[model samples]
Structure formats: C-alpha cells, structure tokens
Target: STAGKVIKCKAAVLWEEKKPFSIEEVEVAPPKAHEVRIKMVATGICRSDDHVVSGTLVTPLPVIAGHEAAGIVESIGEGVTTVRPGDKVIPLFTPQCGKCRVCKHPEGNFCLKNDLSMPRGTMQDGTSRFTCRGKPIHHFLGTSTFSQYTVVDEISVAKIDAASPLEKVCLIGCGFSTGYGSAVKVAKVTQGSTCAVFGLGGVGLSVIMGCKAAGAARIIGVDINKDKFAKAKEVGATECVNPQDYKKPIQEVLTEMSNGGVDFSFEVIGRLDTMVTALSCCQEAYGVSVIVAVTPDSQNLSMNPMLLLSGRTWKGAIFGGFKSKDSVPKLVADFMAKKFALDPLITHVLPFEKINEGFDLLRSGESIRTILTF
Candidate 1:
C-alpha cells in the first residue's frame, strides 16, 4: 500500500510565468493531520490555469499548477473522517470549512478559509508537502492536480459517487460548476426569462446549458469571435450576436433586441469593459447580472453607478455559488444519472504528457474542454 509513504512521481511544475511547465520528478509527502492524499485520475485544462502561465492571473510560482480534476483518495491523515482511501474525489479550489460564518450562512459560498484572497501556496500549517530538487514547491489554488499524486486539506476534497467517470466529470471540479451554478444557483434564473450571455467559452456555454435547463425562453449568445456561436447554440443558445458586426454598443444592441433590456445578463469574460456592459444590458428595474470572471491583481473596474441605481442586482460568484464539499458530489451524481450531457462540453482529450498541447488548443479557442488523463 502507498498509504503513509512518500511517493516519488511525475508532475508538471511552473517555475515562472510566461514559461512552459517543466515535467519533473517530485516527491509527495504523506498527508498531515486533517489532510488527504489523492492520486489524480483525470484533469481538465482551464483558462485560469493559463492565466497563471501568461502572468496575468496571480499565483506563487515553482508550484504544481492544475485544478479541475477528479481523483481517487490514496490515504488520509489523522482526524480526517469525511474521506477515506479508495474513495473518488475532486479537489475544491474554493474550500469550505463548515464552521466559518461564510460556510454557516445560507447565502454564502466563499469560505473564510479560502486561499483565493491571499494565496500563500501552502497547506494550512504554512508548509508544503511537495519537494523538487531539494527545494520545497508551493501548491496552486489549494489543488495542484497537475501531479500524479498530491496532498490536500480534507475540507478541500469532495468525496464523489463511486460510479462517476473521472475523465468526463473532472470539468465539474471548476468549469462546469462555475458556469452552471452562476445561472441556476447564483442568479436563480426564472423560467421563460430572456437572457444574454456575454462570453461563449466553456463556462459561458455551461451557463447557457444551465439557463436552458432552467427553462429560459431566449438564450442569446454574444462573443467577439463568431466561431464559438455554433457550440453555444448546440448547448443552448437560441441565437447569437457578434459585437464587431454592429456599430452600436453591444449592450445597446442586446437591450434593443430584448426590447428594453434582457431579464438577465452574464459576464463570463474577465474584462472590466464587458463587466460594466453586462450590468448595463440587464433590465433596469429587476434584471440580475452575474460576473464570473477572474481578473488580474491591481486592477479595478470603473463604471457608472446608475446602472445598478435602478434597482438592478449585481453579483459575483466563485464556483457558481455552490458550497464545494456538499455540491460537487451532487453534481457528479447528476452527471452520472445523465440529467445533463457532459459530452458536449468536452472537445479534446489528451494523455497527461501532452498537457502543453492541451493548453494550446484552449488558447487558440480550438477546443471547448480538454481532458488530460494519467
């Protein structure tokens, strides 16, 4: 058994931004108290991961850098009761420590113990479990699923159903949940409501899927690139629009198309300009706008307050406002029951070794979702 043993394995490590991940042999230490060790079965390439690579998204470097993955628990440290060896699991980039006020609040999903606010790149004990070339390596988003084996906090590990296909369900770890939750959970999209999706990436498509599943009447897809319209429609987009095709502001066009603003608007692209536009396009009185983008540090949004002064609701969510530990397994079960199709969200599958190529597909907008398997 590999339990309680330091395992030497292969992992892609990022030593610096604007650089390729270096495949290296690293040693993973056994889980500490309240921690769990997992063997990654499958991982998905995500935009945020590339944001870290492009030096736009902030994270400590010389770290293992992948989230959105499914794994099998290999072992658990003392005091870890929620998960055990051999159980299927997904790493929670946004961890939930049930006792925190955010975790205790019914309307809150961002945990007080989350690493996103001030990411130090270590376990709670302020040290790392991974070592490479005799140097300690930092963790990324509390996940580090790029490795063959990784150690994580117990609260950050979601015990999933046994029947889940790790390869396909990995997207639920982030992309699927982040978007789908935005529409159904965060926005509480109403039936027959008219909606406009500001981005047509995987997450945006997932939002379209959720909007459709919620019985939306008109799901309008908007993007700068027209190539994404096809998949957006296949998922749930009723029609599409390209901003470049019109001289008027895209938000004005959407407002005109929906006849006095859409009932809901989603900003999936992480641009300050689009964020304000999303809020501006929603109905003045009751429209809800949700922003689901990750922007770089030291950046701020400048917008007119009148957009929201008209009783419009502006909100943001991480991982779709679903409590990570409780909701991940449920979503996985939903996928297993075939309540929604995950196949359409996935467009590329690659062996773990071809991770760079997978990122390339994502960067070029040539692939919707890319699954990297061990």
Candidate 2:
C-alpha cells in the first residue's frame, strides 16, 4: 500500500550525540531516481555506532542510527535494473560503484562512491529520504537501517541469496566481511604461521576464524576482558590472554610467548597504542601486521622508522578489502552452503524498541554482536 508514496515507519533517531536512541515515527520518502527503498528486517549494533554516542567517532546528529543490515527492496526508482522490489538485500556501508577506478583494479576493493573521505548524511543527490515531524533526518553511513525502511543507491545494496536468513546474514553488511577478509583477503595469512589478534571483540574473534581457515599454527586472542577468552577459543583462537595481567607491555609479552614474535599480528581495537604493539608483536624481519581497527580519521600515527627497516610490513583494509557490491553476496552464499557459521559472534537478538538496551549490551561487553529486529 505504501508503494510510490511516503511510508510511515518506526525508527531509532538520535536527535543529539551521547544520548539514547529515541524511537520515533518517521516518514520515509519514496526512492528517487537511481535509488531503492528497503524494508529492513534486521540491523546490527556496531561498536562504531556506539562510538558516536560516546563522542568518539564523529558523524552528523538527528540521524538514523545504523549501517549494517539486511532487508528487502520495497520499491525501486527509475533506472534501477539489477535488483527489484522482492529482492533480499544488504545495505553496503562501503558502497561499490562497479566502474570506479578502485573497483576496476584487481586487488582494490575500496570504492569511489563512499562517504569515507567526506560523509554527508544524505543520499548521493545531497538530500535525505527521511523526515521526522517535518525535520529532515540525516542518513547514517549510507544504510540507515535503524528504521523500518530506508533508501539507498543501487551501488550500496547487495542482492544476496533468496533463501538467506536476513537476521543472521545481516552481519555480512559490516563486521563479518571485514574481520574474516582482513586475514584471508588482505593479510593473505599463510599456513602454519602464528597470528596474534589484539582484541577479542566480534571483529577480533572473526579474525581468529580467518586465521583458522588459513591453517595458522597458533592463533592468540588478546583482550582486557577475560570473559571473552573462551568465546575466542570456540571461534578459532588456540590461546587467549589479558593485557592487564602482565606488568610488561603486552607487545613484549606476546613476543616472548611466540618465541621472538608471531608471524602476523592484528590490532582489532581502534587504538594507536595497540597499533604499534600489534606491529611490534610480529616477527621483526618477515612479520606482517594488519591494523584491522578504525582509528580516528584525522589522527596521525607515529612509530620508529626502524620498525619498517627490517622489512616489517604494516597494512589495513576497510571491509577487509571485500568489494561490497560483488563480494558480500558470495560470502552470504557460502553461509547458506554451511561452509561457515557466523552465529557465534552474535550473542543477543532484540526488537528495535530495545535499541538502548542493545547499546548497553555492546558497551558492557556482554554481547559480541547484537541484532535489532524491525
């Protein structure tokens, strides 16, 4: 009944930063030219989403509060050919315009059509498709799946397997892709190598999963929270440690544990201190350190130049370098085939009304990843 017209939907809107998400009746405008309206089934609670509330990661306010989600196309605008109204789709936070320069490169996955460099909480056309009480609501990242419905460009939505479970597979929209791909895709971890992951959060644990897939001899999970160590092992880590336990710097401890250093180390926690430690914990000559965390965009990183003199490599990737438009669907298909299970990472599932509760679960470290159903 809402086709080609405004749809009234329930959305969690943040009118200001560092406050709880307010559930409001919002008006979702119909998709404009080259855009598609999606009926969200499930959206995940991201640590990055919480960062904005904690005044860490900065984004516009009064915006819809989500990025990674899976939904169905409610309607399509003019010139949208690849996906139709009935399709199962995940809104891509890292949008991929297939013809962009990065998309054309074989090893490159970061797309040209994205808000990475400059985020304007509007559609590509510079206007929001949402409004509440006559005030325009800014989009979050590009998905805005915190609402019952959201509008996105064709380039930002991935059409996945028809039989895919939206609630579970929605994770592919963000964390899973990045965590798994950082080890398998970007780091290209070798068999029998040792991997030390600094942070046992969802992404860090998923990095353990990738290391297991790569046949790593030892996968060490590091976190301040000891409760996460068991879950880390269940996912793939061979051992787990808490940085707070040792009087020495965590990097030195890891180096001694791995008999000099591990072959690979990942800084999954978004901190410059851990970034340096992660790199330092790797084998000095041939170790590869991957910064899998999202640090403050403008924050400058500093380390001794001698760190790189021994051919120690440091690198990172967004979405683990998975080309969202083309690769996310394939990973979803793999999930459907039971080639991998993503269920371990998600601890709790709740309705959208419980969004505030979900945020607490994320911050308190009780839930690895939480899914909000709309």
Candidate 3:
C-alpha cells in the first residue's frame, strides 16, 4: 500500500473564485518519485486561503485551498528517505529544497521549488495528482489540506514529534510561525527594546508574543478595532492604541508617544499605507520595520527615501524567515517543550464540516485562529 494505488477521499473543492467551497469526493493519484502521500488530520484556516477563495490572490480554479496542515505520512514515493509511513508531519507551503541557492542563504526562506510550483498549481514535474468530477484539479501552494489527503514533495514536509498536538501545532505551518519568526529572526528585537505592531490578527498577536519572548520592554499594539486590544494585551501588548480614536495619523501618534519612535515596528495588515506608516514610525537612527502581511501583487509602496536614509530598515518575511523543512520541526519542538506561547493564539477549533463558519469568524475579525479538524 505504498505509492502505487490511487486514493479516493473527501475534499473541499473551490470550483471558482469568490464562491463557497464544494465538499466532494476527490481522487488522489499515487505519489511519484521523491513525493509523499499525507492523510491530513487538522489544518489552520489562514487569510492566504481566503485570498485565493476571494480572488484577491489569483491561481488556477478548481483547486484545493487549505495549506497549513499537520498529518501522518501514509506512503512514500520512490527515492524518498526523509519521511516514511506513520510519520507525523506538517506540510510546508514554501518548500525548502536544501540544494537551492536561496536556501543556502541564512537571511531568507524562499525556496526554488516553491517559486516554480506556486504559479502552476502542479507538482514539480508539472502535473497534477488530483481530479474531481472527472476533471483534473489543481493543487494549492503544494499542500492542499482542504482535502482529507494531499500529496507533496519530500522536501515540503517536516516531521515532528509524535506527541505534538496536530491541531495546535498546525498553526506553526503558517501565521504563528510567520509572525514569531518575523520578530525573533528577521527584526531581531533586542532585550529592553521598544516595539510597535500594526494589526491585531493572528500574525500581529504572534509578533507580540515573540517580542515578549525576546524580552522587549514595551510592545505597543495598533489596530482600528478596540475589541482586539484585550486579546492583544493578553498575548504581550504592553500598551494598546486604537487608530480610530486619534485625529493625527497613527504613525505620528506613535512617534509622539515614544518620544522619537519605537525601536521596531511591523505591518501585518498588507496595505501599502500601513507599510509606510510602519516604516515612518520607527526610531530615526536605528528603527527597523518588517512587513509580515501578504500584500496584493498589484499593490506598491510609496514612501520618502529619507525614512531609510535615517537608518530605518524595511524588510519582508516569507514564512517568518524560517526554512520550512528545517525550522518548522524546531518550532514544533519548542512548542512541545513549553518554550513559547501557543494555546492563547487559538480562539476556536471547529470540525471540518464547519470550516466555512470558521472562515466567517476570521473575516469578521472575531477569532484569532480557527483550527479545522478532520
């Protein structure tokens, strides 16, 4: 039962953009060379998936949508050694082929195979393993966890300890890892430093947690919704500022309150204006800003060059500067060891049948993270 048989399973299929998912039967072809078949148990509902569903992020239609998931390896293809049947693993949206030139660099996590596969919605060989309703269906970000089972490249799966909770740790696959790593790895916030985070979604809240873990003296949370302030503070925010209450720009307000500016800032809203504000509110000499939000492909940032010349640096993070195949397991280990915060980030856990309800909670800004269990 290893890699030669086609598997029939249930899946949430997106027939087209801006439409609700159709739960249907799907056929998953056997894994090819260096691929692995996964029986996903739990997945985290992320905004990126919503982007795909809402047509904000364009990709092939009739695709499986969810990506951040944890599961068991049901079978291994030929030449696979990293993982075998019965292994507990998380699938990486950004696959890390260690041999890629970008993987060799320490500053980023963008992988060559990921870049190549993102646009095509197919396996590395440029073919799809999924079909529904007698038509071939495209994959989503290499790991289509909306389906009960998915196939991915060997380099895209990270095996974790068997004791780790699949539902909670599934978050490490996306938003939580992205925010935590953006703070701990990319911005590299120092002890006693001042930080400001824009937006109060799962990612921004994780940034607050990471900053707290890094020993930052003050973590300011910025958001238009005052309702999120309580949860933001519960995570790590030392002060909360509602942009709606202030007549001056949020950036100016933050600058005036911090005397010069915060030592670090982040934009997790994915808006060009918020990115500009995040960059402009940094301290004049040594402030650093990281963009943790996934912005639209058509959006562009406009800012004064002096913001950078004054020693403020602007950088972006893809998957939180984490090399997925390598670092995701470590994050899982850390979570299991109780080295960081994980539980507080999850506000809701729902059955797979209620996945659309979970997405509704996210769209209404009523939930931090909604985990879908199969």
Whole-model Cα lDDT per candidate? 0.91, 0.89, 0.89
- TM for every model, in the order presented, reads 0.98, 0.97, 0.97
Alpha-carbon RMSD to native, per candidate: 1.1, 1.4, 1.3
Residue 111 in model 3: lDDT: 90
Give candidate 3's whole-model lDDT.
0.89
User: Clashes in each model (backbone N, CA, C under 3 Å)?
Assistant: 0, 0, 0
Which is superior by TM-score, 1 or 3? 1
Q: Which is the leading candidate under TM-score?
A: 1
Give a tens-digit lDDT track for model 3, residues 1-374: 54589999888899988888888899999999999999989999999899888888888888898888899999989999899899999999998888878888886688988832347888778898999967999988888889888999888899898889998899999989999998998899999999999998899998998899999999999998898899999999999999889898998999998889999999998988988999899897899999997545566667889888978889987898889999999999999889987888889999887878988998987888999999
- Per-residue CA lDDT of candidate 1, range 1-374, in tens? 78888999999898888898888899999999999999999999999889889878777878899989999999999999999899999999998999999999999989988878888988878889999988889998888999999999988999999888999989999999999999999998999999899999889999998899899999999998999999999999999999999999998999999999998889998888888898889999999999988576557889888888898999999999999999999999998888888888899999998889998898888888999999
Segments of candidate 2 deviating more than 4 angstroms? none
Candidates by TM-score, descending order: 1, 3, 2
On residues 176-238, what C-alpha lDDT tens digit does candidate 2 reach at each position?
A: 888999999989999999999999988998799999989999999999989999989998899
Model 2 RMSD in angstroms: 1.4
Which TM-score value belongs to model 2? Answer: 0.97
